[PDB]
Ligand binder design. Structure first.
Ligand SMILES: [Mg+2]
Ligand SMILES: [Mg+2]
Ligand SMILES: [Mg+2]
Ligand SMILES: [Mg+2]
Ligand SMILES: [Mg+2]
Ligand SMILES: [Mg+2]
Ligand SMILES: [Mg+2]
Ligand SMILES: [Mg+2]
Ligand SMILES: [Mg+2]
Ligand SMILES: [Mg+2]
Ligand SMILES: [Mg+2]
Ligand SMILES: [Mg+2]
Ligand SMILES: [Mg+2]
Ligand SMILES: [Mg+2]
Lengths: 50, 203, 104, 116, 119, 155
RNA sequence: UCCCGUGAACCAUCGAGUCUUUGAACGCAAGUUGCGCCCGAGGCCAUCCGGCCGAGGGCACGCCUGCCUGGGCGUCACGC
RNA sequence: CGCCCCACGAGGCGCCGUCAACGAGUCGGGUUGUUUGGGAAUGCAGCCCAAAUCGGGCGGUAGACUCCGUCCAAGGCUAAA
RNA sequence: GCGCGACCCCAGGUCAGGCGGGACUACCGCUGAGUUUAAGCAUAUAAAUAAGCGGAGGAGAAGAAACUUACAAGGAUUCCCCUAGUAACGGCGAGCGAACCGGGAGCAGCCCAGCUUGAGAAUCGGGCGGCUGUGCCGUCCGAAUUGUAGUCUGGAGAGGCG
């Protein structure tokens, strides 16, 4: 909500920085397995629940 | 040699001298807090024989405990079971009140280690035990050859675990032959030893 | 350390000798081997046993005497040989005897 | 006595006088000027602030307060702030709008540090 | 800059160099947002040199401070030998060797002698 | 604390003290007590300040002469165990028991002991005042075994 | 220049260091970066040689040994 | 392997006969609950009773007596297996 | 209008310290079921367990007989083997169940309180200072005579003698 605690804003910051598709270059690091970012979250699908 | 005189004086516990001096103390005790520091043993010869010394770091605490048994703490007295564990009010606790006093003082006095405890007064409601504790940090106790044994780490919360003189009595270790053989090393260690299905290699 | 010849208890085994825990004070005294010093020179001491028979007492004395005949003891210091010790030439030939050096 | 109530007497206390200091080393300043002023944000929306309103937009350590921001903006850059506004931008860091007293020129400072 | 030369410096010059490194990182952090290329990488060197000079400062300061409070005086909780809580509470050796008179006599007399057999 | 220590003495008043404890509350009268304590002060035990000098200055008598010239120093004796030892060997020529020892059982029996072994005793008032004689915080019992020949009659 | 060496390394290893907010968690709290008190390196002016901004650091609870300040005719002595 | 040499104090061994102190609401008893293989009750616990010093606990059937064997509680520490 | 000593007890951000929490294999203590078995079930069994609440160490607990035995007797603790699915116990039903003896593994005994310096607290602590720094020494304060230290622990021991 518009009146959010600083703790919840603090944790929304990090759950924001944790949404980006994996960098283009990681994919060529040696003996690599990370393929796509399997920890995406969408605001309409998976609610943080906090 | 005074301790023998005072020893028999305290042995004659129905004489009128002890009846007086003991009832008045029962009033004084009943008017003070449950756990209280007392600067001197009230029974110096009893304390001597249990290892009290007039040396710094040995402190004496009077713990008041209540009398009577243990009534099963369930939601009303309603025990879900078969008629044979369906009783409430006549069950007795398995640790003596002396040990309960030691183990009350063990929870109150975190930093100091229980050594012993001895009866001092009693009535219909309460028993009063004076519990000798030791400060295992003061140099006068760290440099005594006779009582270092209590500063080694295997001796933390003796009373919480059953290792004092009153502890052994309710653990069943006053006794040696049969009549006391199941209680060594402990009744649960005996039970495990006796239940192990020993399946040897070349059975 | 050494052990006594004793009899077993219990009718089933009364006739079979076996090793005990220690020589009684009476054997250690009558052998010339003091109470405090028998564990020092490798002889057990058992304060709890009772001797009721000359036969047992003399048998255990015989074990003590044989052991004191074939015992060698190094000095507490290098040159100071006191009473109860043994000669240098005796000490130079002592080995670690292994197994049961007195079978019962 | 006068009153039927015994209130506890007045005793006297001494101040702590340790025989050994608990923390010997002198604590360094960790919210120093260089932590407290990370880097000036240089979006075009802020570039407009530089020339319209005589303001510099910094990104400051999240545990900053306006008093420390003005003090550091003075020690660094050798200016003063007539007023600072702060907000914690949703990505996580704090952003501070430092308005210069109109003695100093924001263009001049922006070109003394290189923003525009 | 190399720790060999840093340990070979005065206190004031050491503080100067910290001021200079944090100002050089000040400038590289500025130009991270705008410019790029070859001065974007000097950041990592400058950060590590800040760490070097601060580690030098702290190591030398605490070494001096041990030299002064290690006069066998009361030592502070940031110098007192941390090992583990159990080790700190064990008894000292002169305290674990503490015995009684009836026992120190039992060893001054009547020790454990050295014996063999077959004599 | 004050409240309980007041009903303490009040309840000791109300209750019927048995004779063994009531032989106290019958103390020495002030005049004879002061006369006695004058002699007790004359025979005080040794100061800490004075006990270093007596061991310091015999150092030379041992080092050079090698011969001890001490005569017996005679002072009052104290301490419950020691005084019961003296009394029960009957080496105690005068006993002075504090009335107010707590716990009382430490001296409930010294009157009877001195009585049935025929040793003169008094139940004086003030264990702290006894303690002052010997330089301790309490004394709880004193006894005299021997006095100087210059004051036998006074004794 | 990191190269026949005070010397690279997402190297091994461990002694010298740092170790934000928390947490038994300890100033009081807590859907609060909420609200207190004490000390204080430094500097300003002087409403005095004092006050203000301070960097840092403190303030829990029960306890043990010692010390300081106290209370109670509880027991006393010595006194007005 | 070297320098320092161990005593009038302690211990051992032997003689003696006079001493010879040993742990209290603790043991023990009744009853109650639990526990046990422990059975006129194995332990433990509550409550009440409540000690002894030519004395106390045991000898797996409750009891009185005579004798016997056995040990000395109610304080504490202790590796290895 | 006093100066005091003790006792009890206060408040101290006083000097120096010790306590809480965490992991679960094993170890110690309390608490404590029922499904099941009994071809029903109500004691019994499940079980002196699972769960619950606490305490430690690297092992813990136990431990030098107020023991067993009836022998020609043995001699602390612990574990393995046998004793023994036996004595016992049990709606004597289902079921349950140890010990002494013996064989092995390993082996180790100790220390206090008391009557016992009284020509003399010889004991201990804290502050300060010095050094050889896990301590030792010099000095001050204090604890302690309601007894610290020393001798003694039943196998003895205290004495006197050699
Ligand atoms: Mg929706
Ligand atoms: Mg705002
Ligand atoms: Mg139960
Ligand atoms: Mg029963
Ligand atoms: Mg019953
Ligand atoms: Mg033990
Ligand atoms: Mg139930
Ligand atoms: Mg069924
Ligand atoms: Mg069925
Ligand atoms: Mg059914
Ligand atoms: Mg069963
Ligand atoms: Mg469980
Ligand atoms: Mg153990
Ligand atoms: Mg068979």
């Amino acid at each position: 909500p518009s009146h959010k605690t600083f703790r919840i804003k603090q944790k929304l910051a990090k759950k924001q920085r944790q949404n980006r598709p994996i960098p283009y270059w990681i994919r060529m690091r040696t003996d690599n397995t990370i393929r796509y970012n399997a920890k995406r979250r969408h605001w309409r699908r998976t609610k943080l629940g906090f | 040699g005074a301790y023998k005189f005072v020893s028999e004086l305290w042995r004659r516990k129905q004489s009128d001298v002890m009846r007086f001096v003991q009832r008045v103390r029962c009033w004084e005790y009943r008017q003070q807090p449950a756990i209280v520091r007392i600067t001197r043993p009230t029974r110096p010869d009893r304390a001597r024989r249990l290892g009290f010394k007039a040396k710094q770091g040995y402190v004496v605490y009077r713990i008041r405990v209540r009398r009577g048994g243990r009534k099963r703490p369930v939601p009303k007295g309603i025990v879900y079971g078969k008629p044979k564990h369906q009783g409430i009010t006549q069950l007795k606790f398995q640790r003596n009140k002396r040990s309960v006093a030691e183990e009350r003082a063990g929870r109150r006095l975190g930093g100091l280690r229980v050594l012993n405890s001895y009866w001092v007064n009693e009535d219909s409601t309460y028993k009063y035990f004076e519990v000798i504790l030791v400060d295992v940090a003061h140099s006068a106790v760290r440099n005594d050859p006779r009582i270092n044994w209590l500063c080694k780490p295997v001796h933390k919360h003796r009373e919480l675990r059953g290792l004092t003189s009153a502890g052994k009595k309710f653990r069943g270790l006053r006794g040696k032959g049969h009549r006391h053989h199941k209680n060594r090393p402990s009744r649960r260690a005996t039970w495990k030893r006796n239940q192990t299905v020993s399946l040897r290699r070349y059975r | 350390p050494l052990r006594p010849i004793v009899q077993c208890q219990t009718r089933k085994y009364n006739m079979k000798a076996r090793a005990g825990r220690g020589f009684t004070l009476e054997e250690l005294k009558s052998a010339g081997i003091p109470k405090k010093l028998a564990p020092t020179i490798g002889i057990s001491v058992d304060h709890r046993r009772k001797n009721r028979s000359l036969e047992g007492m003399q048998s255990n004395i015989q074990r003590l005497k044989t052991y004191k005949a074939k015992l060698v003891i190094f000095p507490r210091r290098a040159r100071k040989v006191k009473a109860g010790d043994s000669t240098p030439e005796e000490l130079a030939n002592a080995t670690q005897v292994q197994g049961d050096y007195m079978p019962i | 006595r006068t009153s039927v109530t015994f209130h506890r007497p007045k005793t006297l206390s001494k101040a702590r006088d340790p025989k050994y200091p608990r923390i010997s080393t002198p604590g360094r300043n960790k919210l120093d000027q260089y932590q407290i002023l990370k880097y000036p944000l240089t979006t075009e929306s802020a570039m407009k602030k530089i020339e319209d309103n005589n303001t510099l937009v910094f990104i400051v350590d999240l545990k900053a307060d306006k008093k420390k921001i003005k003090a550091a903006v003075k020690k660094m850059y050798d200016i003063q702030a007539k007023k600072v506004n702060t907000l914690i931008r949703p990505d996580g860091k704090k952003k501070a709008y430092v308005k210069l007293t109109p003695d100093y020129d924001a263009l001049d400072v922006a070109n003394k540090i290189g923003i525009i | 800059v190399k720790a060999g030369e840093l340990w070979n410096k005065s206190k004031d010059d050491l503080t100067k160099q910290l001021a200079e490194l944090k100002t050089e990182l000040g400038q590289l952090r500025i130009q991270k947002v705008a410019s790029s290329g070859s001065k974007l990488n000097r950041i990592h060197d400058i950060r590590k040199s800040i760490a070097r000079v601060l580690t030098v400062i702290n190591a030398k300061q605490r070494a001096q401070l041990r030299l002064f409070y290690k006069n066998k005086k009361y030592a502070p909780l940031d110098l007192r030998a941390k090992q583990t809580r159990a080790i700190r509470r064990r008894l000292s050796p002169d305290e674990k060797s503490r015995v009684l008179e009836k026992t120190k006599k039992r060893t001054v007399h009547f020790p454990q002698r050295k014996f063999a057999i077959k004599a | 604390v004050v409240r309980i220590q007041r009903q303490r003495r009040i309840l000791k008043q109300r209750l019927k003290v048995p004779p063994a404890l009531h032989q106290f509350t019958r103390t020495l009268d002030k005049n004879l007590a002061t006369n006695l304590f004058k002699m007790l002060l004359k025979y005080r035990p040794e100061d800490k300040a004075a006990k270093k000098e007596r061991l310091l200055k015999r150092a030379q008598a041992e080092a050079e002469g090698k011969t001890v010239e001490a005569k017996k120093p005679i002072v009052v004796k104290y301490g419950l165990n020691h005084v019961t030892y003296l009394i029960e060997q009957s080496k105690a020529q005068l006993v002075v028991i504090a009335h107010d020892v707590d716990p009382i059982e430490l001296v409930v029996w010294l009157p009877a002991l001195c009585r049935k072994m025929e040793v003169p005793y008094c139940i004086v008032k003030g264990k702290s005042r006894l303690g002052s004689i010997v330089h301790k915080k309490t004394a709880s019992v004193l006894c005299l075994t021997t006095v100087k020949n210059e004051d036998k009659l006074e004794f």
